Design a protein around this nucleic acid. Structure first.
Ligand SMILES: [Zn+2]
Ligand SMILES: [Zn+2]
Lengths: 598, 87, 398
DNA sequence: CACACACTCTCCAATTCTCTAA
DNA sequence: TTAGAGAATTGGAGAGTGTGTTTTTTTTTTTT
């Protein structure tokens, strides 16, 4: 048993008296400071830590963890009773006028309190949240599958009577409630006045509300099982912390959903459950001098996938893909090869390095396609758009394996992306436009066997030229025997299996975070071409077109491609004007990509 | 239970009734000659408000039809001749 | 009385607000000279439209507090401004006649919020948001005055809508029969109403996120002014209403559904004898044929005869089987100028269309019949060739 | 099932009938 | 002769009771 009044007094004592020596030994009363802020309305949410509560009463922490909703109410009541001690927009105006009438505690309450969970509690998986943990504070990890828009949830409804000019209040707890109709005040009832109640949305307390669904991490599920899911209901300042696809740990109260009416007799003693979220947590000039070393271009190209030898100019092209040209701007590239040629490994490296990216197969996936898809979620039945590799990759790069094996719907979708960088999709017969400006990194196979150079690329790869010409660079990752390189590759693979790590390579790859910083500040530079370099572009382009005509996949898009690549290298040099080396690099990269194809 | 108001002479001699009607026009003002329509509108507005406060259940015209009959009763009549002049 | 009126639990006086807005109308001569909105109220007398558009920036510059009261309490203030405008429209021009009372339509020129950041604290505020219309419902008839008739004795009465409900008479005044007054639906009075679903613009979205959407409701005289696919800055009141758990039960979900009570639209992506004489003089210019053919598609190079043929197609032959429509075929490699030329020229003429020859075309060449999703009835969806009945149809990858 | 239609049944009281005084 | 107090008859307000509540496989014709 418990004496909850004494518990409230002990909670008041903790809030008044706790200090933690923050800001390097200033002996701050942290909860007193936050109480001052709440009283002044400069702060709305108060995340009390049960690790702090443990430092003077472990029994109180146990009582909170075992009966969390009760103690949430007790902590809130204690804080509200203590705000005047530390009291040195529209609802504020209404509370002022109601104080004038005095001259509904839940309405006058304009703060919220949450328990930041204790570190002694291990963070569970969703599957480990047993029925014994109902009504108890639990910490749960998972992927955020889906999040609803923030909606207003009525906490305390406020009505006004037409006949007697009196306000009436209706606190709300259940997910459904009966709105009041006829006036209950005695001056209406005794006079039989027939006065009725009008809801005042202006003078009634709402709260931000958001419904999301967590899901098990795939590598923690048992072997033969579907991943489990849990509905998480989020209120107040906890809203908008999460996004779909994010990894989170949620401290909250595991509770049952108490439905009304016909569902009660149908379900019987069983009940659905939700997690009442209390806390959601989410799982350089020396370096610029290193960048300043003029090796940096080749240093980065070496840092790109030391697991793959050779193809260094392809690595340079991939670097320029991540950099992008002047804003168009995406350096789409394609690299064909046989199966197993290390082509997939290279694409996997770009997907891992890039800050925003996706990796998928052109074929036929049972997942969400390259375009987004509309899920149903039939417990609610509300259809919602989700995913899409191109959409998830929007600001970055989308990697497609076996691009040749795409369906015609996928080919038309990529064609639309190449044209205008947006796609069309239907939710419920109606349709919208959905945005995707990702660069495409395409890997494709020969239609049959190992590539034969005697056959042209479109006839061999079996892709339409309308798509295949979109890519700025076309590379052929051909594989043939070579004794010493095969032995080096084998030694690398065997060391990887033997030690689970790449062997030393007689150099140090740059940190991927530092590479990301570098390409970010690089992408923030905005080059422009001068007229002399435009003339140089003209001369180089016409000579290259002579070579292509004498050996035809060269057009105005070729001039635009070399301009894009030269501006990309100008970004790489981190200078706001292009130079002869940029055009030379673009010309040789295109030429030697054709040579690789030849 | 069954606490239904009635509007009989006890209601009319309550505080909200004739004792209130003796005083409701203390705040009022009238324009007089040539503006009798506006003065009538103010007059009916004030006494309609008084009727509503006294017995909200009825419309004003129905309230008048009730009260014009109900004034004949002896209790409200004695209270009337008290209100007239003074106690 | 007006001076005694104050907005509920707000201390903003209605009469003071009305007089302040009348002062704004009287004094605001300086958008950068008569007052601008009194010039508009001079124009409305002959134009005949029932509305006055006003800029919230102008109200803010004239008076910060009046603008703040408008934004905070539009539900009371906008009717007060309507009363002010209808008083001014008979103070000035007292002999005028107009079929409806004037509706003021405040708006900020730019978005005050984006729809992802709307909060419960914004409920019943005046806001404006940018978006693209996804769907536009049928014209909903919404009742505004209920006409009741006695089934026994043909006595009729009329009752106003209170807050969507009806105060049904319950007994006929001319024959005292209970439950004898019946609602005559077609003798009742109705206003126009329409639902519009608005999606945030693509540039405003965060990186790779699916769109948020909001529901709009547009009432009489502002009802059918937007179409799907267009872009608008829409100003309205951010309402929050309860939704019933079941159609036969009055219990309501604790979570309120929200929508925009639209006050003003501003489309943002839609955009004489002097013209006649300029065109007539230009027709006499030497090599006008080459001039117009060169004006066609400035981005495209050297294709003189192709542009000349396209020009002759766009002018067409003499109507009067005497088909006057000129048919043109462009032929060449993929990636060449023909697709760009088609995508350019389709928007250069009225009644024009552009579509793909493949199955991925948004509007097909063939007419077909489909179930209209919002109502699930058959609709004859004609193809691009039929929709371009007196224009050019650009068929790419023919 | 718990929240709404439809029907029955009960007693309160609203209005008129009759006798009396002014 | 006219108007108020006591007794009788019937309307109906209220309580109680009863009832009502997309997604997969297999086929068929026609489209290429
Ligand atoms: Zn009341
Ligand atoms: Zn009747």
């Amino acid at each position: 048993l418990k004496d909850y009044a004494l518990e409230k007094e002990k909670v008041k004592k903790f809030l008044q008296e706790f200090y933690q020596d923050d800001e390097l030994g200033k002996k701050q009363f942290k909860y007193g400071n936050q109480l001052v802020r709440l009283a002044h309305r400069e702060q709305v949410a108060l995340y009390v830590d049960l690790d702090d509560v443990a430092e003077d009463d472990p029994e109180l922490v146990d009582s909170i963890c075992e009966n969390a909703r009760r103690y949430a109410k007790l902590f809130a009541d204690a804080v509200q009773e203590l705000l005047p001690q530390y009291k040195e927009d529209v609802l504020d105006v209404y509370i002022e006028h109601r104080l004038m009438m005095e001259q509904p505690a839940e309405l006058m309450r304009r703060f919220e309190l949450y328990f930041q969970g204790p570190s002694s509690n291990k963070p569970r998986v969703i599957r480990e949240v047993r029925a014994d943990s109902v009504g108890k504070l639990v910490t749960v990890r998972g992927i955020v599958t889906r999040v609803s828009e923030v909606k207003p949830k009525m906490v305390v409804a406020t009505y006004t009577c037409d006949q007697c000019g009196a306000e009436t209040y209706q606190p709300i707890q259940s997910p459904t409630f009966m709105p009041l109709i006829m006036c209950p005040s005695q001056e209406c009832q005794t006079n039989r006045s027939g006065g009725r109640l009008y809801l005042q949305t202006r003078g009634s307390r709402f709260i931000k509300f958001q419904e999301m669904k967590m899901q098990e991490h795939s590598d923690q599920v048992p072997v033969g099982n579907i991943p489990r899911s849990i509905t998480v209901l989020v209120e107040g300042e906890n809203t908008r912390i999460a996004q779909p696809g994010d990894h989170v740990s949620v401290t909250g109260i595991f509770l049952p959903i108490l439905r009304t009416g016909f569902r009660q007799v149908v379900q019987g003693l069983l009940s659905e459950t939700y997690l009442e979220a209390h806390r959601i947590v989410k799982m350089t000039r020396e370096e610029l001098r290193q960048i300043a070393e003029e090796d940096f271009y080749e240093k980065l190209a070496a840092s790109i996938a030391p697991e793959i030898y050779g193809h260094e100019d392809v690595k340079k092209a991939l670097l320029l893909l991540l950099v992008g040209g002047v804003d168009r701007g995406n350096i789409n590239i394609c690299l064909m090869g046989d199966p197993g040629v290390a082509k997939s490994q290279l694409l996997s490296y770009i997907d891992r390095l890039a800050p925003r990216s996706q990796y998928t197969t052109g074929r036929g996936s049972s997942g969400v396609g390259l375009t987004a898809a509309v899920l149903r979620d039939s417990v609610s039945g509300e259809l919602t758009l989700e995913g899409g590799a191109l959409v998830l990759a929007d600001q970055g790069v989308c990697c497609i394996d076996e691009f040749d094996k795409m369906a015609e719907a996928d080919r038309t979708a990529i064609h639309e992306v190449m044209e205008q960088q947006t796609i069309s999709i239907a939710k419920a017969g109606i349709l919208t436009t959905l945005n995707a400006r990702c660069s495409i990194l395409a890997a494709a196979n020969p239609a049959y066997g190992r590539y034969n150079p005697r056959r042209s690329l479109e006839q061999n790869i079996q892709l339409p030229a309308a798509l295949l010409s979109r890519f700025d660079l076309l590379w052929l990752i051909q594989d043939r025997p070579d004794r010493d390189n095969d032995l080096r590759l084998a030694q690398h693979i065997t060391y990887v299996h033997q030690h689970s790590r790449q062997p030393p390579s007689q150099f140090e790859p740059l940190d991927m975070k530092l590479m990301r910083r570098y390409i970010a500040m690089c992408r923030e530079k905005q080059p422009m071409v001068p007229e002399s370099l435009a003339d140089y572009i003209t001369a180089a382009y016409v000579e290259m077109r002579r070579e292509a005509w004498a050996s035809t996949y060269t057009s105005a898009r070729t001039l635009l491609a070399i301009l894009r690549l030269s501006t990309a290298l100008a970004r790489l040099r981190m200078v706001d004007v292009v130079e002869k080396e940029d055009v030379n690099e673009a010309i040789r990269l295109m030429e030697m990509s054709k040579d690789s194809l030849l | 239970k069954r606490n239904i108001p009635k509007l009989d002479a006890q209601r009319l001699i309550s505080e909200r009734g004739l004792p209130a009607l003796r005083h409701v026009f203390d705040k009022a003002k009238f324009k007089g000659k040539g503006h009798e329509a506006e003065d009538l509108k103010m007059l009916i507005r004030h006494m309609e408000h008084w009727a509503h406060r006294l017995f909200p259940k009825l419309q004003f015209e129905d309230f008048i039809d009730r009260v014009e009959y109900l004034g004949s009763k002896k209790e409200v009549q004695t209270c009337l001749k008290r209100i007239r002049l003074d106690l | 009385l007006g001076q005694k009126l104050v907005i509920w639990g707000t201390d903003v006086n209605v009469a003071a607000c009305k007089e302040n807005f009348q002062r704004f109308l009287q004094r605001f001569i300086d958008p950068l000279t008569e007052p601008l909105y009194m010039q508009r109220l001079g124009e409305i007398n002959v134009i005949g439209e029932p509305f006055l558009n006003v800029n919230c920036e102008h109200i803010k510059s004239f008076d910060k507090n009046l603008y703040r009261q408008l934004i905070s309490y539009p539900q009371e203030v906008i009717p007060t401004f309507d009363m002010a405008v209808n008083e001014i429209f008979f103070d000035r021009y007292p002999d005028s006649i107009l079929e409806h009372q004037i509706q003021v339509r405040p708006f900020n020129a730019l978005k005050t919020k984006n729809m992802r950041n709307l909060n419960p604290e914004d409920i019943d505020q005046l806001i404006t948001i940018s978006g693209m219309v996804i769907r536009t419902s049928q014209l909903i008839p919404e009742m505004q005055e209920a006409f009741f008739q006695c089934q026994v004795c043909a006595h009729t009465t009329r009752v106003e809508m209170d807050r969507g409900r009806i105060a049904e008479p319950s007994v006929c005044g001319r024959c005292h029969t209970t439950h004898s007054m019946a609602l005559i639906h077609n003798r009742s009075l109705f206003s126009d109403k329409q639902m519009i679903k608005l999606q945030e613009s693509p540039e405003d979205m965060p990186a790779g996120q699916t769109p948020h959407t909001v529901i709009l409701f547009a009432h009489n005289d502002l009802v059918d002014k937007v179409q799907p696919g267009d872009r608008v800055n829409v100003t309205g009141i951010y309402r929050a209403v309860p939704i019933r758990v079941n159609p036969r039960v009055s219990n309501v979900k604790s979570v309120y559904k929200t929508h925009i009570d639209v006050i003003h639209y501003r489309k943002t992506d839609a955009k004489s004898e002097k013209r006649v004489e300029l065109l007539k003089e230009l027709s006499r210019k030497p090599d006008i044929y080459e001039r117009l053919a060169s004006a066609l598609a400035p981005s495209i190079y050297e294709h003189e005869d192709i542009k000349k043929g396209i020009l002759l197609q766009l002018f067409g032959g003499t109507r009067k089987k005497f088909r006057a429509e000129i048919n043109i075929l462009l032929c060449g490699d993929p990636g060449t100028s023909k697709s760009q030329l088609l995508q350019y020229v389709y928007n250069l003429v009225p009644r024009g269309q552009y579509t793909s020859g493949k199955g991925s075309s948004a509007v097909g060449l063939t007419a077909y019949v489909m179930k209209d999703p919002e109502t699930r009835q058959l609709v004859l969806q004609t193809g691009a060739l039929v929709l371009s009945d007196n224009g050019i149809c650009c068929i790419d990858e023919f």
